[PDB]
Structure 1
Amino acid sequence: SHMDTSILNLRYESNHLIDLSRYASKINIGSKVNFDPIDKNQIQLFNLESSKIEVILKNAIVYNSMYENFSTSFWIRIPKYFNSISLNNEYTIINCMENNSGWKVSLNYGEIIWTLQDTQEIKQRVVFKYSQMINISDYINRWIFVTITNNRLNNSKIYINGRLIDQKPISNLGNIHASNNIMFKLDGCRDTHRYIWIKYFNLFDKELNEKEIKDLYDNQSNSGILKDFWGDYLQYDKPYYMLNLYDPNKYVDVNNVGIRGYMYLKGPRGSVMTTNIYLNSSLYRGTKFIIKKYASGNKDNIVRNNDRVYINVVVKNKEYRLATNASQAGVEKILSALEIPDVGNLSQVVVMKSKNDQGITNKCKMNLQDNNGNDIGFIGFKQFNNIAKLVASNWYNRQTLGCSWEFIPVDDGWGERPLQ
């Protein structure tokens, strides 16, 4: 029933970053652009002149109008601001301004900004602002879906993860004559170590509606592959610190290895800080988990939705197996960290599931099964005489955030120094 409204669809395909739209606009990649080795649609731009991508627009789609509606969408991952040199330093990242008219995306401390300017210097801005004084952020250093829409008779709107954040009137702007090119480059950034990650840039020749935006968000989320906390693909054989979303100020520890010990949650996490710049919960706490292949026949190390795996727990630089004896009384089966040669017939197979909904991105569930494939239940926790022990429980399966987890690898955009 439809029309392709995407007039620029920038994707990595067949070994190159290209425009997939009918216009096939030309792409000039600079010499210091980094691509993620696992997902080549993920592009890293540094604070360097050669870290840039320029799109040469076909003339038919250069914006020069008093009336035409248009939108843009992309994903971005912005490292934590670390130093006061980033306060009050708006810097352009996606530039389609020519002679002070056009559009641009810029960033500032805790901000993503869209600016429109007409040929008579009338401007409007729409702004997403996120805090760095917050225990756990949905936004700092995590993949964010941005969508900006513009209706020349009323409002410009910015959406984040499919949700409307800010809307401002633009009907007083006259002719907007944008650039013949789009420059993806950090422009005016005083922090020499600043960078961004970006992916899936699109332009559209209409004002996208809410349904269209949510569909783009769901589609581009790649729900077939599980994600880590930052929004990158979850991997096998990669150590992760654990976050339980129900109890986000607690971390995972072990009270003795073996079948008479147990895994548990304890807190508080403690804080990471730079005065006036950030104050957040420490993320590099507790015993690391490593996801191990069991049933998957894919020969990459990406964790897919519904993969059956084992979970190893790292204690003193040695791996143990997360397991339980499902015969123990009561619905909740307490998890222990076992010597791998000693697991025997104990329950240890975990079904990994992505959980995509309207809350924080990148949630994962872990359904423990016995050796006949019967569900023992989702991994969460249960308070036993004031100790929050990790359990597998079919109580979750009949119905929450107690059984929702995120996997946090060390990342330079977070900047925390592990204690050990």
Structure 2
Amino acid sequence: IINTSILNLRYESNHLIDLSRYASKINIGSKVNFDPIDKNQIQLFNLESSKIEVILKNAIVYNSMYENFSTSFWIRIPKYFNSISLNNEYTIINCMENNSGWKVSLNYGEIIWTLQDTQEIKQRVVFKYSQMINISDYINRWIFVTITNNRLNNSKIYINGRLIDQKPISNLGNIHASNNIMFKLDGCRDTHRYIWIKYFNLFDKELNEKEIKDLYDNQSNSGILKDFWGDYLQYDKPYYMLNLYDPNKYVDVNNVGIRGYMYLKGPRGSVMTTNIYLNSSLYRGTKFIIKKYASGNKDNIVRNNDRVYINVVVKNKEYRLATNASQAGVEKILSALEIPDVGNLSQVVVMKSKNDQGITNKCKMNLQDNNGNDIGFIGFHQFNNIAKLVASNWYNRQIERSSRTLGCSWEFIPVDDGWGE
């Protein structure tokens, strides 16, 4: 599908370019930022010179009553912090000329798609997300957007590959879109507002549900683990930990050493600005730092099946996550060990991805002994009314026997400007 797209905006050979057969010209403003870790991730600020303009080849300029078309892209929208963002819809992707064409716009907790013909007939499809929520799947996290348009039926908006809303557009007549596509914050009153965007595509047909799911999987880069926000998980980067079975708890340490243990304690508390957002605090607990087991690779991205060590930060000092698997029972309680005294304790962790129909960017950690034998996925277990962190082959066996397992799925949360906590 990507090879058949009429616009394939990608960053390669050290420049942003249209990879389609049309090779439409790209005009990049001076205040456009490209992520050094992944230059396909584009940051657009609320500045006149923070814009990208695509000069479409004349053959693909939309001017039709009947041609179906679709668009897909990923977006990461920082949390709205101020009341100035209320009741302020602002365009981000503009293909309107004389108020005919299409455009993508944003508002407080909304992603909006608008179609309008040449006779003042308009239709909108909207995806709504709340900021009054403990843990949000959408606030400041990478979202895959797909919008399809059937001129004889409906316009549909998809989020992470799932249909969210559809509205009829068959009453619209001739849609004559703009000769260009302007990626730019237009009409936003929040001077600090920005967006992240990547993998923009334009299609000259109505994508079906299977094609959208396949695009969502192909562009997810499943061989690379992700942090909570959807960026690449990295080594040597401090992360606040979130266990998905107990989202209201955070990781803490009950004394350093084999005599102590790591556990989950709550509540997290809340961060809030009245009438704007009310969420669970994410910057809580002892931070984890992922360390390389194979130092022969210079790259700092954590990939699937990588073996790692887990460092634990306690009072600005780093310790080693480990356990003695010879302890009684199937739930091996984890401790934070002094790095010089790890000895032969089990500490090697195999990082894994976990992709189901729930929250994205799940990670799993399979602890192994120094001989390579599985100790079990890292989760937690109730000991004396305390949720102590454990490694248990019980988790691994349920997955092997097609049983559902919860408690061993984690998210790594780094400090990000889009969260502001």
- Normalising by structure 1, report the TM-score: 0.98
Cα separation, 1, equivalents of 2:93 and 2:295: 40
SS in 2 for 1:403: coil
SS in 1 for 2:321: strand
**Deviation of 1:357 (Å):** 2.2
Cα separation, 2, equivalents of 1:307 and 1:361: 19
**Deviation of 1:5 (Å):** 3.1
Deviation per CA, 1:251-303: give whole Å up to 9, x if none: 00000000010000011100000000000000000000000001253211110
Deviation per CA, 1:16-50: give whole Å up to 9, x if none: 10000001000000000000010000000000000
Equivalenced residue count is 414
Deviation per CA, 1:323-376: give whole Å up to 9, x if none: 000000111100000000000000000000111222111100000000000000
Deviation per CA, 1:208-239: give whole Å up to 9, x if none: 00100000000100011110000000000000
Say whether the 8 Å CA contact 1:296–1:307 is kept in structure 2.
no
**Deviation of 1:385 (Å):** 1.5
Partner of 1:269: 268
**Deviation of 1:4 (Å):** 4.4
Deviation per CA, 1:372-398: give whole Å up to 9, x if none: 000000000000110000000001101
**Which deviates more from structure 2 when the two are superposed, residues 356-365 or residues 388-397?**
356-365
Cα separation, 2, equivalents of 1:361 and 1:62: 36
Say whether the 8 Å CA contact 1:5–1:206 is kept in structure 2.
no
Cα separation, 2, equivalents of 1:370 and 1:198: 41
Q: 1:296 to 1:147 in 2, by over 3 A?
A: farther
Deviation per CA, 1:190-222: give whole Å up to 9, x if none: 000000000000000110001000000001000
Partner of 2:344: 345
Partner of 1:54: 53
Say whether the 8 Å CA contact 1:75–1:201 is kept in structure 2.
yes
Say whether the 8 Å CA contact 1:238–1:290 is kept in structure 2.
yes
Any unmatched runs of 5+ in structure 1?
none
Cα separation, 2, equivalents of 1:303 and 1:240: 13
Any unmatched runs of 5+ in structure 2?
399-404
Cα separation, 1, equivalents of 2:141 and 2:42: 14
Cα separation, 2, equivalents of 1:307 and 1:130: 34
Say whether the 8 Å CA contact 1:73–1:201 is kept in structure 2.
yes
SS in 1 for 2:245: coil
Deviation per CA, 1:105-128: give whole Å up to 9, x if none: 000000000000000010000000
Cα separation, 2, equivalents of 1:307 and 1:389: 25
SS in 1 for 2:326: coil
Cα separation, 1, equivalents of 2:254 and 2:213: 44
Cα separation, 2, equivalents of 1:20 and 1:5: 10
Cα separation, 2, equivalents of 1:335 and 1:142: 30
Say whether the 8 Å CA contact 1:296–1:308 is kept in structure 2.
no
Cα separation, 1, equivalents of 2:356 and 2:63: 38
CA RMSD of aligned residues (A): 0.8
SS in 2 for 1:218: helix
Q: 1:318 to 1:167 in 2, by over 3 A?
A: same
Q: In the alignment, is residue 414 of structure 1 matched against residue 419 of structure 2?
A: yes
Give me the identity figure in percent: 99
